[PDB]
Tab-separated table of C-alpha atoms in Angstrom:
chain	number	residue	atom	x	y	z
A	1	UNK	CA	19.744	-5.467	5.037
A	2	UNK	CA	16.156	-5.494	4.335
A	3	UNK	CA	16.482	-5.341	0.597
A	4	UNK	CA	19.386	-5.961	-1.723
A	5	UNK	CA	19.788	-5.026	-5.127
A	6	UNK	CA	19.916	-7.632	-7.989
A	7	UNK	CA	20.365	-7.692	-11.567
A	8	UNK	CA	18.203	-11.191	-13.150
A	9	UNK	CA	19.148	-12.512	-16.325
A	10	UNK	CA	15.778	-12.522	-18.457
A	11	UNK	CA	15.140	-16.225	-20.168
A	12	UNK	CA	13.028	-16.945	-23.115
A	13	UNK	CA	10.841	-19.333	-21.555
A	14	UNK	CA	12.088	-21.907	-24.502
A	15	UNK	CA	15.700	-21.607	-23.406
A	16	UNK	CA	15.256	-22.631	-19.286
A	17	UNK	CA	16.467	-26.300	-18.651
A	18	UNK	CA	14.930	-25.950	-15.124
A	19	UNK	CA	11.445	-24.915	-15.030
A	20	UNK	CA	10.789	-24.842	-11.745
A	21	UNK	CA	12.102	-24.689	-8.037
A	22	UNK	CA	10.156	-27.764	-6.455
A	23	UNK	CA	7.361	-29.276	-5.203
A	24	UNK	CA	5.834	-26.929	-2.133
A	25	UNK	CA	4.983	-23.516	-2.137
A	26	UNK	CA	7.579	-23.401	1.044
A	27	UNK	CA	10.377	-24.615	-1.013
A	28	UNK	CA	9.745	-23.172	-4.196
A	29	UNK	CA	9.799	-19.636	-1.888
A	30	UNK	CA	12.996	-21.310	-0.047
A	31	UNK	CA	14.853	-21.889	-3.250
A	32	UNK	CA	14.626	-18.737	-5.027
A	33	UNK	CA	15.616	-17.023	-2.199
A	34	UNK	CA	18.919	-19.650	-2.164
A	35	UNK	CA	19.250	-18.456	-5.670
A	36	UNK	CA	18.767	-15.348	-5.777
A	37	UNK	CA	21.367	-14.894	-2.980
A	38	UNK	CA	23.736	-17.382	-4.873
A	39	UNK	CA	23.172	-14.942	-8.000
A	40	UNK	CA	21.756	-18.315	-9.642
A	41	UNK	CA	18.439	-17.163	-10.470
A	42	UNK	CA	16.511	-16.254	-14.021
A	43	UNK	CA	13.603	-14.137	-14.632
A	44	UNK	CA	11.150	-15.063	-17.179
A	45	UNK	CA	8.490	-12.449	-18.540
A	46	UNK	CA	4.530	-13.567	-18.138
A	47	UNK	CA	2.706	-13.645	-21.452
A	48	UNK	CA	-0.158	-15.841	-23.031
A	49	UNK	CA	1.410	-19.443	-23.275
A	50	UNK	CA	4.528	-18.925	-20.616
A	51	UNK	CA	3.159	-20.225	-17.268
A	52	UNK	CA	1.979	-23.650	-19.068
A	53	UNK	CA	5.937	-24.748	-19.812
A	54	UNK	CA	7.022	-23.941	-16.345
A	55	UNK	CA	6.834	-25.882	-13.502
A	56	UNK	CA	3.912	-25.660	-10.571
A	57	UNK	CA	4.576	-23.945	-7.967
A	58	UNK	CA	5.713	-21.350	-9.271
A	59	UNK	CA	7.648	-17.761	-8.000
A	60	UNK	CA	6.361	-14.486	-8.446
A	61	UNK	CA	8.243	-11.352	-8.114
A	62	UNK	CA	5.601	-8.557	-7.657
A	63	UNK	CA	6.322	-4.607	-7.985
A	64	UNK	CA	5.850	-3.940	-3.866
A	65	UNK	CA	6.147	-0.172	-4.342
A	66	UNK	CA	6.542	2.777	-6.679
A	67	UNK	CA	12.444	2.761	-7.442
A	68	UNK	CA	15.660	3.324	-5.828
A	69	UNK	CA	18.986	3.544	-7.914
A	70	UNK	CA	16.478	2.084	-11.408
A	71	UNK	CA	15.623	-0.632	-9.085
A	72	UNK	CA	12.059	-1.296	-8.858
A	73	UNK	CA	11.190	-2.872	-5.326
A	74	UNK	CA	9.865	-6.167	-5.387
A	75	UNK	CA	8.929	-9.583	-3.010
A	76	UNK	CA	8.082	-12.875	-3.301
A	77	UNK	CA	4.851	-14.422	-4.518
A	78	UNK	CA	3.957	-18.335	-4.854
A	79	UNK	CA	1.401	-19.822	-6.703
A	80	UNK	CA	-0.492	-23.723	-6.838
A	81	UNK	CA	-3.252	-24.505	-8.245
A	82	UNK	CA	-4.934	-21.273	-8.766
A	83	UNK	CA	-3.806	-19.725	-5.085
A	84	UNK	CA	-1.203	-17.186	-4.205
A	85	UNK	CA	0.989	-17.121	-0.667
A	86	UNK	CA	1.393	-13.315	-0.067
A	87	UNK	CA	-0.246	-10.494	-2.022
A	88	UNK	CA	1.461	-7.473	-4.089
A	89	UNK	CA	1.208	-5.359	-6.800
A	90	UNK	CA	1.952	-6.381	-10.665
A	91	UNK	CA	3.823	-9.113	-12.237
A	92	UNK	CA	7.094	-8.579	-13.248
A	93	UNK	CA	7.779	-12.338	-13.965
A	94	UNK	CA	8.156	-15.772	-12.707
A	95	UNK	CA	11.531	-17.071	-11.403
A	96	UNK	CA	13.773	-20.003	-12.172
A	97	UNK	CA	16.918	-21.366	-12.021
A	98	UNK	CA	19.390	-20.053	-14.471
A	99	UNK	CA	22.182	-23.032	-14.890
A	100	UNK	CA	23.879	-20.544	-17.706
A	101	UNK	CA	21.224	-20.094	-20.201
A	102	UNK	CA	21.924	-17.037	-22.573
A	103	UNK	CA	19.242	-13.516	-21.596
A	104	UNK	CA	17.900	-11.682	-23.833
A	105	UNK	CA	18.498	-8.678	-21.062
A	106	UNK	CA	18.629	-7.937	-17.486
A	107	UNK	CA	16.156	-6.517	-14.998
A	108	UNK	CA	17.339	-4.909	-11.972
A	109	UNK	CA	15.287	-4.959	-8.942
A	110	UNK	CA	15.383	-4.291	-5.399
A	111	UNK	CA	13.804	-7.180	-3.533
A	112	UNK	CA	12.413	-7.161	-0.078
A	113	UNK	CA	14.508	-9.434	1.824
């Protein structure tokens, strides 16, 4: 399929034990698509002070349209150091590994696979 539907735990940025993916803008992509497909994969809301205690580079999902089934349709964004790989519409967090941490909700989205 082109897109599959997902449900992300949301972390409080203060919860997530792994703030980031890695090191390159490929792998960071690489790995959240491993964990989003593993169903191992956190969202985290961007406000004032959130970006700052996570890890460079980071992952972007972006709204990529305007939503089947409640799912709104998203992709894939990195960032480092200031410049974005890809281009889409609004923010509707930054990705991390979730190894269990408790959500405050979930967001379901359909992602452009």
């Amino acid at each position: 399929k082109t897109h599959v539907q997902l449900s992300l735990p949301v972390l409080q940025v203060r919860d997530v034990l792994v703030r980031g993916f890695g090191d390159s803008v490929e792998e960071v992509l690489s790995e959240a698509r491993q964990h989003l497909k593993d169903g191992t994969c956190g969202l985290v809301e961007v406000e004032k002070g959130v970006l700052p205690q996570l890890e460079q580079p980071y992952v972007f999902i972006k709204r990529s349209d305007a939503a089947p089934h409640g799912h709104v349709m998203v992709e894939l964004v990195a960032e480092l150091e200031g410049i974005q790989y890809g281009r889409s519409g609004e923010t509707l967090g930054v990705l991390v590994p979730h190894v269990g941490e408790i959500p405050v909700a979930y967001r379901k989205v359909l992602l452009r696979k």
